[PDB]
């Protein structure tokens, strides 16, 4: 059972296909149209079924050409309202019907952000994007809003003719709208069955440039050139991923670079990954996010978590593949550097949440918990740490990647739980079950806090970062003159980042040390978003008033939650910036992404 969904479960009926016909009304901030669901009964004598909805207006529900009865239940908070449809004829097992629902979204759909022309790059046209994961697809269309059900889809989307629509699907043509010549209809086909959280739409003034044999980058005209360069490693990463995971089955791998309020680093929408413009460092140094989204084309999109309790299956295996792609590209010592940095992020989250916090468990029971509130690094890094531990336990990366390939093969086009994964792990490693029974499964999967065993990490690339951090932490005032720009000479952008991560773990430092660091290193000049983030956090936690406007500027000029949330939190904790932080949120909140708005409000207690 999926406790985040109000709809009939997969054991009762299963959506096979969605045909979406809709129109994007920028004037009203609504999507309007029909969702035609092809539904297969899994039961004898099926006479009704229930769908997920959230802030939808239902006009009518048509089956076999006639309107039928339906009822909306009472809102159940972040789950929305259940929609019961009365079937006109009882269905036998495996019988299929088509239910055509006429609906309209609310301007406040938590799935959607509607941007004014002023919030875009070109300043002449508005822009819309969706973010359905985890349980926001129900806020666009009525559906069984659970990743335990996979469907194919087709769509026809009418938008102002000067704008472009794209979806998580193969582009299937465009024509004028016959109902309104000021409009264009874009068509789409997704032939591969997908969980509904992978349904995605963008409408905006979009241009494209080809960057590989199966990849266009899409953005507003002013970002295209920069994006083409930033993401030029994409085809080489796809090739490596195919080697590790098996055939890429989705046809195209395009990239869409969103406006700066996009709430995450990436979203693995099939055929069209969405990314944050904060990846545009100018030097490709944040391309691990592309490797991560590419990896989801196997782990997440082919093998999918059956409910959001097992989200770690999606993320852990993805981070595991991600770090492999980057290890292939840049060396095994780099894979270990990233893995070790990941362990540090995990310490930070466990430290932040508390070592007994429920959200520090690998598997989390999400009944009554809004998944957006639970979301953190834990599933990523505690999941990664388990697989890395297991890799070492069972014989190394070549051996463990054999298992990853077999696991993707085995569960392609299915939705699985943690027990399903573990079962296959024991089946694949039947000759090593003595070694598998050494792992403390209950601790790793179900206990809060740091994992019971820390893997082994090569420290080669890390040592210089630790060394410099320690010099600063142990320095007294009479040592500050010894620091010099030449300190950073042999450090990559990745190492400069890790240096700051290490130092930030011991924050606050004395204000004079921070002032000296800006004097000698000019971190204020760095536009790499990861580096700038940690630097400004270090400044604010170390009580440097000068950094206040910089931190406020970063927190609001982009909306990647990774950055925006902890910046606002830090600025709220610093008495000098507290009032401004709260006032700034209040002023920007209406024009924020709905989920980000909600979470920053909670963080600030406003
Ligand atoms: O956009 C998204 C995507 C996934 C989630 C699910 C978040 C989550 C966190 C966690 O610590 C354990 C889980 O089992 C699930 C929430 C929001
Ligand atoms: Yb001294
Ligand atoms: Zn992911």
């Amino acid at each position: 059972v999926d406790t985040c969904s109000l709809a009939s479960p997969a054991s009762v009926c299963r959506t096979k296909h969605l045909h979406l016909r809709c129109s994007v009304d920028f004037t009203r901030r609504t999507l309007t149209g029909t969702a035609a669901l092809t539904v297969q009964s899994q039961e004898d004598n099926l006479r009704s079924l229930v769908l997920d909805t959230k802030d939808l207006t239902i006009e009518k529900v048509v089956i076999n050409g006639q309107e039928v009865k339906y009822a909306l239940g009472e809102r159940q908070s972040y789950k929305g309202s259940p929609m019961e449809i009365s079937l006109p004829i009882a269905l036998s097992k495996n019988q299929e019907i088509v239910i055509e629902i006429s609906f309209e979204t609310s301007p406040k759909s938590s799935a959607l952000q509607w941007l004014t022309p002023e919030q875009t790059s070109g300043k002449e046209h508005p822009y819309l994007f969706s973010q359905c994961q985890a349980i926001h697809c129900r806020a666009i269309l009525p559906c069984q809003d659970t990743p335990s059900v996979k469907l194919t889809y087709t769509a026809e989307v009418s938008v102002p003719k000067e704008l472009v629509a794209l979806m998580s699907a193969i582009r299937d043509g465009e024509t004028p709208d016959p109902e309104d010549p000021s409009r264009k209809i874009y068509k789409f086909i997704q032939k591969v069955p997908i969980p509904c959280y992978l349904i995605a739409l963008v409408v905006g003034a979009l241009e494209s440039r080809q960057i590989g044999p199966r990849t266009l980058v899409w953005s507003e005209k002013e970002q295209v050139e920069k994006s083409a360069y930033e993401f030029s490693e994409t085809e080489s990463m796809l090739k490596i991923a195919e080697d590790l995971g098996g055939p890429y089955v989705w046809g195209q791998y395009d990239l869409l670079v969103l406006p700066p309020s996009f709430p995450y680093g990436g979203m693995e929408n099939p055929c069209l990954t969405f990314v944050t413009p904060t990846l545009l460092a100018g030097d490709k140094s944040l391309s691990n996010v592309i490797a991560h989204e590419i990896s989801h084309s196997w782990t997440g999109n082919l093998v999918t978590n059956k409910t959001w309790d097992h989200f770690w299956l999606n993320e852990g295996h993805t981070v595991y593949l991600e770090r492999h792609i980057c290890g292939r590209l840049f060396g095994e010592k780099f894979r270990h550097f990233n893995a070790l940095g990941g362990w540090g992020e995990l310490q930070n989250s466990v430290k932040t949440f508390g070592e007994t916090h429920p959200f520090t468990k690998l598997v989390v029971d999400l009944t009554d918990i809004d998944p957006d509130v639970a979301y953190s690094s834990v599933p990523y890094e505690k999941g990664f740490a388990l697989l890395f531990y297991l890799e070492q336990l069972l014989g190394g990366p070549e051996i463990f990647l054999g298992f990853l390939k077999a696991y993707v093969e085995k569960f392609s086009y299915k939705s699985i739980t943690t027990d399903d994964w573990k079962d296959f792990l024991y089946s694949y490693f039947k000759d090593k079950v003595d070694v598998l029974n050494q792992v403390d499964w209950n601790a790793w999967l179900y206990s809060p806090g740091l994992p019971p065993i820390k893997p082994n990490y090569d420290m080669t690339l890390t040592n210089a970062c630790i060394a410099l951090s320690q010099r600063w932490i142990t320095a007294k005032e009479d040592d500050l003159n010894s620091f010099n720009a030449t300190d950073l000479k042999d450090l990559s952008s990745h190492q400069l980042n890790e240096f700051l991560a290490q130092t930030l773990q011991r924050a606050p430092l004395p204000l004079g040390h921070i002032k000296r660091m800006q004097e000698v290193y000019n971190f204020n000049a760095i536009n790499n978003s990861e580096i700038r983030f940690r630097w400004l956090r270090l400044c604010i936690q170390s009580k440097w008033e000068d950094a206040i406007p910089l931190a406020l500027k970063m927190a609001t000029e982009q909306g990647r939650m990774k950055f925006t949330r902890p910046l606002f939190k830090d600025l709220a904790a610093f008495d000098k910036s507290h009032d401004q932080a709260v006032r700034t949120y209040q002023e920007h909140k209406a024009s924020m992404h709905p989920v980000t708005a909600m979470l920053v409000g909670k963080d600030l207690k406003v």
Side-chain angles (χ1 to χ4, degrees):
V1 212
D2 187 331
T3 54
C4 302
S5 169
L6 303 188
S8 307
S11 62
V12 164
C13 60
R14 273 143 139 145
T15 302
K16 297 326 261 182
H17 188 74
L18 162 67
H19 187 260
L20 173 63
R21 285 179 81 262
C22 71
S23 181
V24 182
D25 190 350
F26 279 98
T27 301
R28 304 181 45 240
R29 289 186 172 199
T30 58
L31 265 77
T32 314
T34 62
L37 302 169
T38 303
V39 176
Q40 176 175 247
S41 175
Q42 309 295 115
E43 282 181 352
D44 196 63
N45 189 37
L46 179 70
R47 288 169 184 266
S48 62
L49 65 306
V50 183
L51 301 181
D52 282 301
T53 74
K54 194 181 178 195
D55 298 304
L56 298 190
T57 301
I58 308 302
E59 169 183 47
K60 69 192 176 169
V61 181
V62 170
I63 306 169
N64 305 317
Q66 309 290 135
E67 300 185 18
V68 301
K69 276 66 231 298
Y70 66 94
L72 295 159
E74 171 156 293
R75 196 166 167 124
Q76 304 188 22
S77 193
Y78 63 81
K79 290 161 187 199
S81 312
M83 176 187 178
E84 208 168 69
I85 295 156
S86 292
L87 301 183
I89 310 177
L91 297 185
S92 59
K93 176 196 253 206
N94 293 329
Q95 189 176 345
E96 291 187 13
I97 57 163
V98 184
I99 310 174
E100 177 189 278
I101 311 163
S102 290
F103 73 98
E104 193 186 64
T105 62
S106 163
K108 266 60 173 293
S109 178
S110 55
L112 299 179
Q113 185 180 10
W114 293 93
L115 305 182
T116 57
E118 315 96 66
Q119 290 176 282
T120 75
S121 301
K123 307 291 179 182
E124 311 198 28
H125 300 288
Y127 189 114
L128 166 72
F129 67 89
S130 72
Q131 176 50 57
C132 285
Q133 204 187 28
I135 52 158
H136 301 283
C137 189
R138 60 187 73 172
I140 298 169
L141 56 102
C143 57
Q144 294 176 282
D145 193 5
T146 171
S148 63
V149 167
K150 299 195 172 179
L151 55 141
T152 50
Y153 84 85
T154 40
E156 293 174 35
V157 183
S158 168
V159 304
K161 67 172 186 181
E162 42 285 305
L163 301 188
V164 173
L166 306 174
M167 297 195 75
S168 54
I170 303 299
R171 292 189 289 152
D172 196 27
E174 84 177 72
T175 47
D177 187 329
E179 287 179 25
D180 188 341
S182 65
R183 296 186 78 102
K184 253 191 213 183
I185 292 165
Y186 286 88
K187 308 196 183 210
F188 304 100
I189 174 136
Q190 177 55 263
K191 71 158 183 305
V192 183
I194 54 159
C196 71
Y197 75 85
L198 292 182
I199 302 177
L201 173 69
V202 55
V203 179
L206 297 174
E207 312 270 27
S208 70
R209 168 159 169 200
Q210 190 170 177
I211 65 170
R214 44 187 170 174
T215 306
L216 280 19
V217 68
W218 295 86
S219 68
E220 281 188 85
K221 187 201 153 34
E222 21 310 87
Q223 276 69 238
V224 176
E225 186 180 315
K226 180 143 200 204
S227 305
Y229 176 83
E230 202 80 43
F231 311 129
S232 63
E233 290 150 321
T234 294
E235 178 61 21
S236 84
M237 295 174 165
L238 278 156
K239 275 183 185 79
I240 298 162
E242 281 189 301
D243 184 56
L244 304 169
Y248 181 77
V249 305
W250 308 85
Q252 190 86 175
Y253 188 76
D254 286 352
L255 286 166
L256 168 69
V257 184
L258 287 102
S261 65
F262 184 70
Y264 298 108
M267 179 63 207
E268 66 268 28
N269 300 134
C271 308
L272 191 56
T273 278
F274 284 19
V275 299
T276 178
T278 66
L279 300 187
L280 298 168
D283 67 356
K284 321 176 190 216
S285 54
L286 309 181
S287 67
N288 69 285
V289 175
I290 304 308
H292 184 94
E293 304 305 333
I294 287 174
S295 301
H296 271 309
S297 311
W298 295 267
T299 48
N301 296 0
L302 283 186
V303 48
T304 308
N305 54 207
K306 190 188 213 71
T307 92
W308 296 112
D309 292 7
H310 313 275
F311 181 53
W312 90 266
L313 292 177
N314 274 33
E315 301 309 331
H317 291 90
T318 293
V319 171
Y320 185 86
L321 278 175
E322 170 199 331
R323 288 184 180 150
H324 274 301
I325 295 167
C326 288
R328 273 269 232 292
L329 276 186
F330 302 116
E332 177 71 350
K333 282 182 191 182
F334 191 65
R335 179 169 83 102
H336 275 252
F337 171 81
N338 297 134
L340 183 51
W343 181 273
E345 279 309 309
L346 180 62
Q347 291 176 114
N348 295 351
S349 302
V350 173
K351 182 146 166 181
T352 292
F353 281 118
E355 50 173 31
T356 64
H357 191 107
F359 295 177
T360 69
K361 298 169 164 183
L362 189 57
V363 182
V364 173
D365 173 12
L366 295 169
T367 321
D368 306 318
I369 304 284
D370 179 347
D372 282 346
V373 165
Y375 185 86
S376 80
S377 288
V378 169
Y380 292 80
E381 295 306 340
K382 185 175 254 195
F384 172 82
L386 170 59
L387 303 168
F388 197 52
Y389 168 52
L390 290 172
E391 171 185 310
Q392 295 177 336
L393 204 45
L394 292 163
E398 291 188 339
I399 278 162
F400 204 77
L401 284 164
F403 162 75
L404 199 53
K405 201 184 281 203
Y407 162 75
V408 170
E409 302 179 354
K410 160 79 170 188
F411 292 120
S412 288
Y413 316 109
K414 318 295 188 60
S415 304
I416 63 168
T417 63
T418 296
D419 282 311
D420 296 324
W421 169 84
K422 202 189 150 205
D423 255 272
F424 182 68
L425 189 75
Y426 271 79
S427 154
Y428 191 86
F429 291 108
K430 99 246 83 179
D431 296 344
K432 278 179 169 156
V433 51
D434 63 345
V435 172
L436 288 168
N437 293 137
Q438 289 165 29
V439 29
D440 189 346
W441 293 109
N442 189 77
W444 275 105
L445 307 166
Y446 307 112
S447 290
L450 283 184
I453 278 276
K454 170 185 186 172
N456 299 324
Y457 300 97
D458 182 89
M459 299 275 284
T460 306
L461 291 184
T462 303
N463 293 147
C465 303
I466 290 160
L468 189 58
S469 181
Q470 286 299 125
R471 287 189 55 205
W472 276 93
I473 288 157
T474 65
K476 280 80 203 175
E477 172 177 309
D478 66 356
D479 301 303
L480 292 185
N481 194 79
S482 64
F483 297 111
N484 183 283
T486 73
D487 300 339
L488 311 180
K489 171 178 71 199
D490 301 294
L491 296 187
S492 70
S493 52
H494 303 91
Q495 293 175 306
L496 224 76
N497 194 49
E498 182 54 24
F499 161 67
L500 281 160
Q502 287 290 323
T503 302
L504 182 61
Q505 287 187 311
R506 283 78 178 181
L509 266 68
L511 188 49
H513 286 40
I514 299 314
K515 291 174 168 166
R516 179 67 173 163
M517 195 173 287
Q518 162 60 199
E519 188 171 39
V520 296
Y521 304 151
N522 195 191
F523 287 152
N524 279 353
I526 288 180
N527 294 317
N528 184 298
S529 60
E530 295 280 348
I531 290 166
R532 186 171 182 86
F533 166 65
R534 290 178 179 80
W535 168 236
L536 290 180
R537 285 199 83 184
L538 178 60
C539 287
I540 294 307
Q541 290 181 34
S542 297
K543 310 192 209 184
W544 195 11
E545 288 175 19
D546 286 25
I548 289 166
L550 309 186
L552 286 168
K553 191 188 162 69
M554 189 167 180
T556 58
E557 286 180 359
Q558 60 70 237
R560 186 180 180 176
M561 278 192 276
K562 195 188 182 166
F563 303 151
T564 288
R565 294 181 70 190
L567 291 170
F568 266 117
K569 259 194 122 177
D570 285 3
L571 286 159
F574 179 18
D575 55 16
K576 289 316 185 303
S577 55
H578 180 276
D579 287 349
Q580 310 158 254
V582 179
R583 186 180 320 114
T584 306
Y585 165 64
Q586 285 170 347
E587 290 174 29
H588 286 81
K589 154 184 192 62
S591 59
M592 277 168 79
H593 185 277
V595 170
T596 309
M598 182 274 288
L599 291 164
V600 170
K602 273 183 195 287
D603 288 341
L604 293 179
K605 297 136 89 66
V606 283

PDB file of all heavy atoms in Angstrom, residues 133 266 268 292-293 296 311 314-315 318-319 375 380, ligand 3:
ATOM      1  N   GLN A 133       7.587  15.390  -8.789  1.00  0.00           N
ATOM      2  CA  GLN A 133       8.108  14.507  -7.737  1.00  0.00           C
ATOM      3  C   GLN A 133       8.010  15.281  -6.423  1.00  0.00           C
ATOM      4  O   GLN A 133       8.229  16.482  -6.419  1.00  0.00           O
ATOM      5  CB  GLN A 133       9.559  14.127  -7.999  1.00  0.00           C
ATOM      6  CG  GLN A 133       9.998  12.799  -7.319  1.00  0.00           C
ATOM      7  CD  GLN A 133      11.459  12.538  -7.444  1.00  0.00           C
ATOM      8  OE1 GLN A 133      12.238  13.464  -7.537  1.00  0.00           O
ATOM      9  NE2 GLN A 133      11.844  11.278  -7.432  1.00  0.00           N
ATOM     10  N   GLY A 266      18.639  19.036 -10.171  1.00  0.00           N
ATOM     11  CA  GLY A 266      18.152  18.381 -11.401  1.00  0.00           C
ATOM     12  C   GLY A 266      16.864  17.613 -11.119  1.00  0.00           C
ATOM     13  O   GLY A 266      16.494  17.415  -9.963  1.00  0.00           O
ATOM     14  N   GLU A 268      15.182  14.158 -13.217  1.00  0.00           N
ATOM     15  CA  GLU A 268      15.457  13.152 -14.237  1.00  0.00           C
ATOM     16  C   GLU A 268      14.247  12.866 -15.173  1.00  0.00           C
ATOM     17  O   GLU A 268      13.954  11.717 -15.516  1.00  0.00           O
ATOM     18  CB  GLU A 268      15.957  11.860 -13.529  1.00  0.00           C
ATOM     19  CG  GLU A 268      14.864  11.155 -12.615  1.00  0.00           C
ATOM     20  CD  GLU A 268      14.865  11.591 -11.135  1.00  0.00           C
ATOM     21  OE1 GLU A 268      15.255  12.737 -10.797  1.00  0.00           O
ATOM     22  OE2 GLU A 268      14.385  10.772 -10.318  1.00  0.00           O
ATOM     23  N   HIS A 292      24.567  12.408 -12.487  1.00  0.00           N
ATOM     24  CA  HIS A 292      23.485  11.962 -11.625  1.00  0.00           C
ATOM     25  C   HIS A 292      22.164  11.827 -12.399  1.00  0.00           C
ATOM     26  O   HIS A 292      21.477  10.802 -12.301  1.00  0.00           O
ATOM     27  CB  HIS A 292      23.314  12.962 -10.479  1.00  0.00           C
ATOM     28  CG  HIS A 292      22.287  12.561  -9.464  1.00  0.00           C
ATOM     29  ND1 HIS A 292      22.608  11.865  -8.317  1.00  0.00           N
ATOM     30  CD2 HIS A 292      20.950  12.759  -9.426  1.00  0.00           C
ATOM     31  CE1 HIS A 292      21.513  11.664  -7.610  1.00  0.00           C
ATOM     32  NE2 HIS A 292      20.495  12.198  -8.261  1.00  0.00           N
ATOM     33  N   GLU A 293      21.795  12.860 -13.160  1.00  0.00           N
ATOM     34  CA  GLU A 293      20.511  12.806 -13.875  1.00  0.00           C
ATOM     35  C   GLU A 293      20.541  11.740 -14.980  1.00  0.00           C
ATOM     36  O   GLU A 293      19.561  11.043 -15.225  1.00  0.00           O
ATOM     37  CB  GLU A 293      20.116  14.199 -14.426  1.00  0.00           C
ATOM     38  CG  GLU A 293      20.047  15.271 -13.356  1.00  0.00           C
ATOM     39  CD  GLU A 293      19.108  14.909 -12.205  1.00  0.00           C
ATOM     40  OE1 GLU A 293      18.147  14.137 -12.427  1.00  0.00           O
ATOM     41  OE2 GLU A 293      19.348  15.383 -11.059  1.00  0.00           O
ATOM     42  N   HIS A 296      19.876   8.257 -13.494  1.00  0.00           N
ATOM     43  CA  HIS A 296      18.448   7.996 -13.217  1.00  0.00           C
ATOM     44  C   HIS A 296      17.710   7.301 -14.384  1.00  0.00           C
ATOM     45  O   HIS A 296      16.666   6.706 -14.166  1.00  0.00           O
ATOM     46  CB  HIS A 296      17.713   9.278 -12.873  1.00  0.00           C
ATOM     47  CG  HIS A 296      17.731   9.612 -11.415  1.00  0.00           C
ATOM     48  ND1 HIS A 296      17.364   8.704 -10.438  1.00  0.00           N
ATOM     49  CD2 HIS A 296      18.023  10.768 -10.775  1.00  0.00           C
ATOM     50  CE1 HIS A 296      17.453   9.290  -9.252  1.00  0.00           C
ATOM     51  NE2 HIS A 296      17.826  10.546  -9.432  1.00  0.00           N
ATOM     52  N   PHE A 311      12.579   5.540  -1.182  1.00  0.00           N
ATOM     53  CA  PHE A 311      13.235   6.563  -2.050  1.00  0.00           C
ATOM     54  C   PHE A 311      14.745   6.364  -2.168  1.00  0.00           C
ATOM     55  O   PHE A 311      15.333   6.602  -3.246  1.00  0.00           O
ATOM     56  CB  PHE A 311      12.914   7.955  -1.508  1.00  0.00           C
ATOM     57  CG  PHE A 311      13.495   9.109  -2.309  1.00  0.00           C
ATOM     58  CD1 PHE A 311      13.285   9.214  -3.683  1.00  0.00           C
ATOM     59  CD2 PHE A 311      14.188  10.127  -1.673  1.00  0.00           C
ATOM     60  CE1 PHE A 311      13.780  10.337  -4.423  1.00  0.00           C
ATOM     61  CE2 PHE A 311      14.689  11.241  -2.387  1.00  0.00           C
ATOM     62  CZ  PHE A 311      14.489  11.333  -3.786  1.00  0.00           C
ATOM     63  N   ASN A 314      16.018   4.640  -5.275  1.00  0.00           N
ATOM     64  CA  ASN A 314      16.239   5.602  -6.365  1.00  0.00           C
ATOM     65  C   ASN A 314      17.537   6.358  -6.207  1.00  0.00           C
ATOM     66  O   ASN A 314      18.371   6.378  -7.112  1.00  0.00           O
ATOM     67  CB  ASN A 314      15.088   6.617  -6.407  1.00  0.00           C
ATOM     68  CG  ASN A 314      13.912   6.146  -7.215  1.00  0.00           C
ATOM     69  OD1 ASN A 314      13.610   4.952  -7.259  1.00  0.00           O
ATOM     70  ND2 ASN A 314      13.221   7.086  -7.856  1.00  0.00           N
ATOM     71  N   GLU A 315      17.719   7.000  -5.054  1.00  0.00           N
ATOM     72  CA  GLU A 315      18.848   7.958  -4.905  1.00  0.00           C
ATOM     73  C   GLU A 315      20.182   7.310  -4.627  1.00  0.00           C
ATOM     74  O   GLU A 315      21.187   7.741  -5.166  1.00  0.00           O
ATOM     75  CB  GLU A 315      18.564   9.035  -3.853  1.00  0.00           C
ATOM     76  CG  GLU A 315      17.341   9.820  -4.217  1.00  0.00           C
ATOM     77  CD  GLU A 315      17.462  10.312  -5.656  1.00  0.00           C
ATOM     78  OE1 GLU A 315      18.607  10.517  -6.114  1.00  0.00           O
ATOM     79  OE2 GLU A 315      16.461  10.480  -6.326  1.00  0.00           O
ATOM     80  N   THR A 318      21.547   5.814  -7.617  1.00  0.00           N
ATOM     81  CA  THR A 318      21.914   6.799  -8.601  1.00  0.00           C
ATOM     82  C   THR A 318      23.253   7.461  -8.300  1.00  0.00           C
ATOM     83  O   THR A 318      24.049   7.661  -9.216  1.00  0.00           O
ATOM     84  CB  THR A 318      20.797   7.862  -8.775  1.00  0.00           C
ATOM     85  OG1 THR A 318      19.670   7.184  -9.369  1.00  0.00           O
ATOM     86  CG2 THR A 318      21.299   8.954  -9.718  1.00  0.00           C
ATOM     87  N   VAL A 319      23.462   7.837  -7.031  1.00  0.00           N
ATOM     88  CA  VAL A 319      24.691   8.464  -6.584  1.00  0.00           C
ATOM     89  C   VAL A 319      25.855   7.505  -6.796  1.00  0.00           C
ATOM     90  O   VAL A 319      26.968   7.905  -7.187  1.00  0.00           O
ATOM     91  CB  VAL A 319      24.618   8.909  -5.090  1.00  0.00           C
ATOM     92  CG1 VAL A 319      26.026   9.370  -4.592  1.00  0.00           C
ATOM     93  CG2 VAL A 319      23.549  10.003  -4.881  1.00  0.00           C
ATOM     94  N   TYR A 375      12.398  15.289   2.678  1.00  0.00           N
ATOM     95  CA  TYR A 375      13.490  15.319   1.713  1.00  0.00           C
ATOM     96  C   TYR A 375      14.831  15.838   2.299  1.00  0.00           C
ATOM     97  O   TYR A 375      14.837  16.877   2.906  1.00  0.00           O
ATOM     98  CB  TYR A 375      13.072  16.193   0.527  1.00  0.00           C
ATOM     99  CG  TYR A 375      14.109  16.175  -0.566  1.00  0.00           C
ATOM    100  CD1 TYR A 375      14.112  15.181  -1.539  1.00  0.00           C
ATOM    101  CD2 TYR A 375      15.084  17.179  -0.631  1.00  0.00           C
ATOM    102  CE1 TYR A 375      15.074  15.185  -2.526  1.00  0.00           C
ATOM    103  CE2 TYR A 375      16.046  17.199  -1.606  1.00  0.00           C
ATOM    104  CZ  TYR A 375      16.055  16.208  -2.529  1.00  0.00           C
ATOM    105  OH  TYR A 375      17.038  16.230  -3.497  1.00  0.00           O
ATOM    106  N   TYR A 380      20.266   9.926  -0.214  1.00  0.00           N
ATOM    107  CA  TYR A 380      21.385   9.967  -1.150  1.00  0.00           C
ATOM    108  C   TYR A 380      22.652   9.374  -0.561  1.00  0.00           C
ATOM    109  O   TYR A 380      23.282   8.458  -1.144  1.00  0.00           O
ATOM    110  CB  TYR A 380      21.703  11.435  -1.531  1.00  0.00           C
ATOM    111  CG  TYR A 380      20.631  12.097  -2.361  1.00  0.00           C
ATOM    112  CD1 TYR A 380      19.476  12.601  -1.764  1.00  0.00           C
ATOM    113  CD2 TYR A 380      20.772  12.243  -3.730  1.00  0.00           C
ATOM    114  CE1 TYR A 380      18.452  13.193  -2.512  1.00  0.00           C
ATOM    115  CE2 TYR A 380      19.744  12.871  -4.495  1.00  0.00           C
ATOM    116  CZ  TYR A 380      18.595  13.332  -3.868  1.00  0.00           C
ATOM    117  OH  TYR A 380      17.582  13.970  -4.573  1.00  0.00           O
TER     118      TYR A 380
HETATM  119 ZN1  LIG B   3      18.384  11.801  -7.770  1.00  0.00          ZN
END
